[PDB]
Design a protein around this ligand. Structure first.
Ligand SMILES: Nc1ncnc2c1ncn2[C@@H]1O[C@H](COP(=O)(O)OP(=O)(O)OP(=O)(O)O)[C@@H](O)[C@H]1O
Length: 244
């Protein structure tokens, strides 16, 4: 009949609802909400949904489901599902991001249909270059996740902005170029995903001049490849760029 940060986090990660059974009335009666400070790790920002996203057997976590649901019934749902990591390492990350990272269609769908921002920028160190993509779109795109990419743009609940730009003004095409490392297998996949995107550049916005967008440096996706030295892809872009 009561719950604290750990109590919930415990069951969520344990992946059981018998101990979550009755979370709503606590929140109802205590007028506390999963959203406010108490139920977050100030260090990171892990909300109980975010713990759930990390802990999942075979891709399953029935917690996620009777959790967005308990969040929805408590007047905090858009706020709850878009919660990102307050830290400097995993800065932008939302529930949605992880679902895409973890290549989970069933979870990425049961998430945006509960109102996940499909424009949330993965702002942290984790996504940056030190050894892109940044946007749920550009991410799925770059991870080779076409089945999800389509779901993002062609979405009935919330369309992904196909011509969006991250910090450093990079679109999905830029992102792809940025990922081309010249391997037989790499060039192939980037080429395909590139093509596929431009094809959806027909059905959804036959009006958009997508090939022509400039990043913060001021390069077209082609112009990037030219300097970036991704010769394989540059050849594709140019070759296709002649209607076949
Ligand atoms: N977006 C992410 N992708 C992959 N791994 C992550 C991500 N965010 C956090 N992690 C890693 O996974 C762990 C988070 O999962 P979880 O909270 O279940 O860990 P835990 O062992 O239960 O407890 P703790 O959070 O104290 O480690 C972190 O230890 C972190 O190193």
């Amino acid at each position: 009949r009561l719950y604290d940060r750990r109590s919930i986090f415990d069951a969520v990660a344990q992946s059981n609802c018998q101990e979550l059974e009755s979370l709503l009335p606590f929140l109802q009666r205590s007028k506390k909400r999963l959203t406010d400070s108490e139920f977050k790790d100030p260090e990171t920002g892990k909300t109980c949904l975010l713990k759930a996203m990390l802990n999942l057997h075979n891709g399953q976590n029935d917690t996620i489901a009777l959790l967005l649901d308990v969040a929805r019934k408590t007047d905090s749902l858009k706020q709850f599902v878009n919660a990102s990591y307050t830290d400097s390492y995993y800065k932008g990350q939302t529930a949605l991001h992880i679902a895409i990272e973890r290549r989970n269609m069933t979870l990425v769908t049961l998430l945006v249909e509960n109102g996940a921002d499909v424009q949330a920028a993965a702002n942290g160190d984790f996504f940056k270059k030190t050894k892109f993509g940044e946007l749920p779109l550009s991410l799925a795109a770059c991870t080779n996740q076409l089945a999800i990419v389509k779901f993002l743009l062609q979405n009935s609940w919330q369309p992904a902005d196909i011509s969006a730009r991250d910090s450093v003004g990079n679109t999905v095409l830029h992102a792809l170029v940025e990922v081309a490392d010249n391997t037989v297998d790499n060039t192939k996949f980037v080429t395909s995903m590139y093509n596929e995107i431009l094809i959806l550049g027909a059905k959804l916005h036959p009006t958009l001049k997508l090939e022509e967008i400039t990043n913060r440096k001021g390069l077209t996706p082609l112009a990037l490849a030219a300097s970036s030295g991704k010769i394989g892809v540059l050849a594709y872009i140019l070759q296709r760029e002649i209607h076949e």
